[PDB]
Design a protein around this ligand. Structure first.
Ligand code: HEM
Ligand SMILES: O=c1ccc2ccccc2o1
Length: 465
């Protein structure tokens, strides 16, 4: 045909706003998909976006035409502070440079190696101490989890961990939780369509901007301190490494290594490496309380393979297919970043007999892949069997895409998987979970879904085993 994917007819400026519900963007798009097909065009306000639903559409685009779909689209709330700088929201040469440097630097600081594994085990031990500190009292686990997770990436980018009592640290965590919540609310999704007017109006979006500004200021302050104490031959952390590269590049007028990219990249890693893992852990504990029989099975596996004395280690995962299926099912059910981060076609593109002009934004509907009925027997239920064959051995799924896929996929994926495995296992090895309500009354549907999937607020107690 040589035309853009079909879709509902947009009105000037507002796009398809009248055919969408900002409080349930995912459901609004899936409903429209029923009518036009798995690949369709929607106009989010003035943004023309091709929506990809289901495994096949998503993989065909992001992997089979990986380079064509390798551009970065927008997320308006985040672009307010990033403005196209930094590794996540950048494009072209800038993205290419900052991504290659970031992956290399994370490796030099132990990601994917024994170095970061010992750092995560150590922090997991601090989480255990903190949980024993509650004496089995009913608590809100939110910041217990985020403080522990954040300290792993914080160790890498800032050189050391924050004290759990540090009040500025809790402040930063509140900013991150606050921004993920805002981008998942109806106003946050309304902002994705009308940022051109809303960025200048009073409202919830202004408080979200202040949380972002708060985080940027904190990073700019840490960078200044590292700067006036830097040893060019002995970097302490990600920031120092970047400063060193910036020194070497001072003679290149076209370098991507300058202050703004350092501040934005560091902020991307601090937020990306904190809130995503935190939200997954929080959701998973709630899911385990709703499903006690699954927790029991996890406990049997942990006691048999690891026992009660030594700390879990990452290699233990090879011997624990059940725990591996459970963590996969938590990320599949949790669907933390349901519409991924927008992509954009790098050049004029032919996709399934559709025409996608260069620059077209793309919404890979990750949640529609994680719940594809063609890949999981009961997509709407929490069931670790989705990741186990008949003998209870771990079984991979091509529809397991919570870190997305393709050329701009999550490069924090290895760190996240190690954190998820070591934190879930070390906590479950030491405690059994007690909910404040009968498992039948636990509501695991999400509190908000937009940019992220946020689970409902809850309290629980960690009882020593
Ligand atoms: C359970 C945890 C996590 C989930 C579900 C997750 C999810 C994602 C997703 C869906 C994307 C967009 C991929 C795309 O455009 O195709 C992404 C990108 C990214 N993630 Fe993660 N992530 C997680 C953890 C992490 C961690 C721990 C870090 C930090 C080290 C991190 C850093 C990044 C970065 C820098 C990008 C942007 C890559 C680029 O634009 O080239 N993520 N992540
Ligand atoms: O700055 C950011 C904001 C959101 C996000 C989500 C997943 C991975 C990395 C991210 O970085």
């Amino acid at each position: 045909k040589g035309k853009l994917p079909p879709g509902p007819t947009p009105l000037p400026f507002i796009g398809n706003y009248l055919q969408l519900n900002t409080e349930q963007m995912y459901n609004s798009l899936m409903k429209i998909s029923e009518r036009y097909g798995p690949v369709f065009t929607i106009h989010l306000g003035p943004r023309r976006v091709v929506v990809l639903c289901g495994h096949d559409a998503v993989r065909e685009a992001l992997v089979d035409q990986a380079e064509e779909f390798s551009g970065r689209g927008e997320q308006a709330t985040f672009d307010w502070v990033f403005k196209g700088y930094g590794v996540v929201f950048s494009n072209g040469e800038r993205a290419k440079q900052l991504r290659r440097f970031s992956i290399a630097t994370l490796r030099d600081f132990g990601v994917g190696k024994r170095g970061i594994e010992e750092r995560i085990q150590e922090e997991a031990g601090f989480l255990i101490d903190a949980l024993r500190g509650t004496g089995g009292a009913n608590i809100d686990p939110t910041f217990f989890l985020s403080r522990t997770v954040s300290n792993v990436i914080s160790s890498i980018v800032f050189g050391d961990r924050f004290d759990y009592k540090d009040k500025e640290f809790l402040s930063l965590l509140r900013m991150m939780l606050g921004i993920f919540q805002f981008t998942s609310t109806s106003t946050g999704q309304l902002y994705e369509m009308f940022s051109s007017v809303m960025k200048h109006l009073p409202g919830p979006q202004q408080q979200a901007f202040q949380l972002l500004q708060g985080l940027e200021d904190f990073i700019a302050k840490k960078v200044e301190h590292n700067q006036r104490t830097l040893d060019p031959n002995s970097p302490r952390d990600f920031i120092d490494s970047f400063l060193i590269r910036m020194q070497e590049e001072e003679k290149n007028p076209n370098t991507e290594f300058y202050l703004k990219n350092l501040v934005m990249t560091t902020l991307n890693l601090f937020i990306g490496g904190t809130e995503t893992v935190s939200t997954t852990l929080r959701y998973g504990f709630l899911l385990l309380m709703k499903h006690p029989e699954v927790e029991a099975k996890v406990h049997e596996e942990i006691d048999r393979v690891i026992g009660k004395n030594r700390q879990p280690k990452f290699e233990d995962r090879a011997k624990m297919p059940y725990m591996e299926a459970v963590i996969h099912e938590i990320q599949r059910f949790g669907d933390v970043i349901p519409m991924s981060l927008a992509r954009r076609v790098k050049k004029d593109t032919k996709f399934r007999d559709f025409f996608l002009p260069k620059g077209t934004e793309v919404y890979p509907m990750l949640g529609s892949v994680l719940r594809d009925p063609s890949f999981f027997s009961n997509p709407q239920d929490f069931n670790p069997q989705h990741f186990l064959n008949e003998k209870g051995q771990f079984k991979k799924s091509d529809a397991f895409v919570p870190f997305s896929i393709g050329k701009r996929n999550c490069f924090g994926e290895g760190l996240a998987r190690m954190e998820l495995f070591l934190f879930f296992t070390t906590v479950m090895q030491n405690f059994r979970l007690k909910s404040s309500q009968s498992p039948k009354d636990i509501d695991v549907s999400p509190k908000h879904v937009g940019f992220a999937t946020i689970p409902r607020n809850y309290t629980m107690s960690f009882l020593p085993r």
